[PDB]
Enzyme design. Structure first.
Site, PDB file in Angstrom:
ATOM      1  N   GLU A   9       9.453  -0.774 -18.344  1.00  0.00           N
ATOM      2  CA  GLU A   9       8.610   0.206 -19.018  1.00  0.00           C
ATOM      3  C   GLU A   9       7.330   0.485 -18.248  1.00  0.00           C
ATOM      4  O   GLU A   9       6.895  -0.321 -17.429  1.00  0.00           O
ATOM      5  CB  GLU A   9       8.266  -0.257 -20.435  1.00  0.00           C
ATOM      6  CG  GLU A   9       7.342  -1.459 -20.486  1.00  0.00           C
ATOM      7  CD  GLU A   9       6.839  -1.740 -21.880  1.00  0.00           C
ATOM      8  OE1 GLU A   9       7.196  -0.978 -22.801  1.00  0.00           O
ATOM      9  OE2 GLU A   9       6.089  -2.719 -22.055  1.00  0.00           O
ATOM     10  N   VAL A  10       6.736   1.640 -18.514  1.00  0.00           N
ATOM     11  CA  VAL A  10       5.518   2.040 -17.833  1.00  0.00           C
ATOM     12  C   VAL A  10       4.324   2.034 -18.774  1.00  0.00           C
ATOM     13  O   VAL A  10       4.338   2.671 -19.823  1.00  0.00           O
ATOM     14  CB  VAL A  10       5.667   3.442 -17.209  1.00  0.00           C
ATOM     15  CG1 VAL A  10       4.358   3.909 -16.604  1.00  0.00           C
ATOM     16  CG2 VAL A  10       6.777   3.445 -16.174  1.00  0.00           C
ATOM     17  N   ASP A 106      17.964  13.433 -10.789  1.00  0.00           N
ATOM     18  CA  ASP A 106      17.712  13.539 -12.220  1.00  0.00           C
ATOM     19  C   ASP A 106      16.538  14.439 -12.565  1.00  0.00           C
ATOM     20  O   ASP A 106      15.796  14.155 -13.494  1.00  0.00           O
ATOM     21  CB  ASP A 106      17.535  12.159 -12.858  1.00  0.00           C
ATOM     22  CG  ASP A 106      17.777  12.173 -14.360  1.00  0.00           C
ATOM     23  OD1 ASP A 106      17.509  11.149 -15.015  1.00  0.00           O
ATOM     24  OD2 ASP A 106      18.238  13.205 -14.883  1.00  0.00           O
TER      25      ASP A 106
HETATM   26  C1  ZYU Z   1       1.672   9.176 -16.360  1.00  0.00           C
HETATM   27  N1  ZYU Z   1       2.761   9.130 -17.101  1.00  0.00           N
HETATM   28  C2  ZYU Z   1       3.828   8.452 -16.674  1.00  0.00           C
HETATM   29  N2  ZYU Z   1       5.000   8.408 -17.402  1.00  0.00           N
HETATM   30  C3  ZYU Z   1       5.218   9.068 -18.681  1.00  0.00           C
HETATM   31  C4  ZYU Z   1       5.972   8.126 -19.603  1.00  0.00           C
HETATM   32  O1  ZYU Z   1       7.254   7.702 -19.108  1.00  0.00           O
HETATM   33  C5  ZYU Z   1       6.937   7.015 -17.884  1.00  0.00           C
HETATM   34  C6  ZYU Z   1       6.247   7.889 -16.847  1.00  0.00           C
HETATM   35  C7  ZYU Z   1       3.810   7.872 -15.425  1.00  0.00           C
HETATM   36  N3  ZYU Z   1       4.696   7.181 -14.730  1.00  0.00           N
HETATM   37  C8  ZYU Z   1       4.136   6.835 -13.582  1.00  0.00           C
HETATM   38  N4  ZYU Z   1       2.896   7.306 -13.548  1.00  0.00           N
HETATM   39  C9  ZYU Z   1       2.667   7.954 -14.679  1.00  0.00           C
HETATM   40  N5  ZYU Z   1       1.617   8.610 -15.173  1.00  0.00           N
END
Ligand code: ZYU
Length: 246
Positions: A9-10, A106
């Site tokens: 997860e991020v 994707d």
């Molecule tokens: C902002 N948002 C992100 N996500 C949005 C939520 O799903 C994961 C990717 C990012 N993923 C990597 N850097 C990011 N900066």
């Protein structure tokens, strides 16, 4: 680095001393994703900083803009001018990737992230792979992606070129940006919506809501035969693509 919140997860990670923000990917593919990420250096691709193997941690540019997906109003899309800008930066990203023999595989709005200035960045190389190496092209046999955005040959062929599949998913993104809806569940004949497009019934949604200049380009991108389908060099010379917009 302290994780302030979960990106979706991020999670967002803020460095205490510097105070700089970032995105941390924690995952216990990944080896390939890390390998491919360390090859990338473009202003339209989410930046890779590093990784640490405690459970694996990936340090990525944080895009405060969020997903391109959230900038799309359902059943409406977004101002043609904004879509064109986004599509221009999306082509820049893909030209680059393709130029170093890498296919994302994707492309979708969930994977197009916007920064503070709103510049688009291509995200998630977990499904990406090399398709050219030592100037040798390799056809792809594996099926990857999401159904609405997948090119039809991926459902029908034992093997296919990488580039036209990425181009096709870019055309689906353009459709979503200008109509606020996906044209079909999947690119197959069984699907009514897909048959209708092949039969040029553009007087239906989503095509009804798209001006003719961008629709003409979608005509050239959403072509079933991956060899007849427009290529990126050609897309650049497209009339809508070079049209000055408000
Ligand atoms: C902002 N948002 C992100 N996500 C949005 C939520 O799903 C994961 C990717 C990012 N993923 C990597 N850097 C990011 N900066």
């Amino acid at each position: 680095w302290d994780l302030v919140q979960t990106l979706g997860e991020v999670q967002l990670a803020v460095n205490r001393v510097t105070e700089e923000a970032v995105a941390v990917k924690i995952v216990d593919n990944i080896k390939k994703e890390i390998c491919i990420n360390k090859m990338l250096n473009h202003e339209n691709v989410v930046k890779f900083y590093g990784h640490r193997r405690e459970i694996q941690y990936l340090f990525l540019e944080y895009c405060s803009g969020g997903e391109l997906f959230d900038r799309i109003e359902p059943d409406i899309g977004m101002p043609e001018p904004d879509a064109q800008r986004f599509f221009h930066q999306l082509m820049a990203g893909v030209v680059y990737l393709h130029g170093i023999g890498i296919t994302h595989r994707d492309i979708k709005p969930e994977n197009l992230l916007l920064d503070e200035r709103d510049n688009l960045k291509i995200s998630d190389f977990g499904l990406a792979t090399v398709f050219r190496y030592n100037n040798r092209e390799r056809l792809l046999n594996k099926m990857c992606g999401t159904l609405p955005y997948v090119a039809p040959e991926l459902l029908k062929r034992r093997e296919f070129h990488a580039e036209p599949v990425d181009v096709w998913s870019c055309g689906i993104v353009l459709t979503a940006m200008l109509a606020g809806e996906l044209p079909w569940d999947q690119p197959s004949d069984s699907c009514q919506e897909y048959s209708d497009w092949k039969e040029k019934k553009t007087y239906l949604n989503p095509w009804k809501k798209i001006d003719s200049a961008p629709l003409a380009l979608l005509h050239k991108i959403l072509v079933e035969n991956p060899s007849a389908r427009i290529t990126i060099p050609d897309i650049k010379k497209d009339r809508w693509y070079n049209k000055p917009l408000k």
